[PDB]
């Protein structure tokens, strides 16, 4: 996260760290959506241009964390993967269309003050909140600058941007399965996700029922916090029928 701030304790209790077993390193962010299911970006698991293709046993999920590097004894919980599910129409060849994946845990995680799931939006909360100008919140342990790493989880609030401005900011083809967020050059304020924030959540607090909903997934950007560029997020509601199908099918 560029130009964000340290998270408060328990501010993002659905935050998940994707951790490589050997060598031990951060791989991505992710989010807790139930006691057995974790949501992330497909490119965190599968991205052939970079020779990335992880299998369940290559990975761990670390839940309840605040510090990036320390082992947070009696607070974080570490879980093994039963199965990875990537969207069958994830487009890694071109533009990361449908950049979404699910991970099922081998065992349910115990909720605590630091570990708690986020809601997924229904059609109406999405239609009400996914509007240009409305702000969401992005969190992660990724780079502090485009070209270092934070001591603790970082947070930044960013406005959703009008789709024509998103489209006009880039030569990549954008789709309805994406939205973009970030300040414009003339807006004074800045902030972005960056490398290592991949797969983490973009959340909004509904003013109707005061619950947090995950509207996006950190997907892609061209640089980090560049003027006139915007961060792109997977549109969770547009892909929810897939999410539900998987969870309904596989438990």
């Amino acid at each position: 996260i560029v130009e964000g701030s340290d998270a408060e304790i328990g501010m993002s209790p659905w935050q998940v760290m994707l951790f490589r077993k050997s060598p031990q390193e951060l791989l991505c962010g992710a989010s807790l959506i139930s006691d057995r299911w974790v949501l992330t970006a497909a490119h965190c698991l599968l991205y052939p241009p970079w020779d990335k293709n992880f299998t369940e046993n290559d990975l761990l999920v670390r839940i309840g964390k605040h510090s990036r590097t320390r082992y947070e004894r009696n607070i974080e919980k570490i879980s093994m993967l039963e199965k990875i599910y990537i969207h069958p129409r994830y487009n890694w060849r071109e533009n990361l269309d449908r950049d979404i994946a699910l991970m099922k845990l081998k065992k349910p995680v115990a909720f605590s003050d630091y570990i708690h799931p986020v809601c997924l939006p229904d059609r109406e909360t999405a239609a009400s909140l996914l509007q240009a100008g409305y702000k969401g919140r992005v969190t992660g342990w990724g780079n502090l600058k485009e070209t270092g790493q934070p001591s603790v989880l970082q947070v930044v609030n960013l406005p959703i941007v009008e789709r024509p401005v998103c489209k006009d900011s880039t030569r990549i083809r954008i789709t309805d399965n994406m939205f973009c967020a970030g300040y414009k050059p003339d807006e004074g304020k800045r902030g972005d996700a960056c490398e290592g924030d991949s797969g983490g959540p973009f959340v909004m607090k509904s003013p109707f029922n005061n619950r947090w909903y995950q509207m996006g997934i950190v997907s892609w950007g061209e640089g980090c916090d560049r003027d006139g560029k915007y961060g792109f997020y997977t549109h969770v509601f547009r892909l929810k029928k897939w999410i539900q199908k998987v969870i309904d099918q596989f438990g």
Binding site: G10, C119, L120, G133, Y134, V155, P159, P207
Partner: peptide, 27 residues
């Protein structure tokens, strides 16, 4: 059921330091 309600914030009626910035944008 209880999704999206944080134990250290919503469940105890405490606000975090920048959630109000989100609310104010929901115009």
């Amino acid at each position: 059921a209880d999704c999206g309600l944080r134990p250290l914030f919503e469940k105890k009626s405490l606000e975090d330091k920048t959630e109000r910035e989100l609310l104010e944008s929901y115009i």
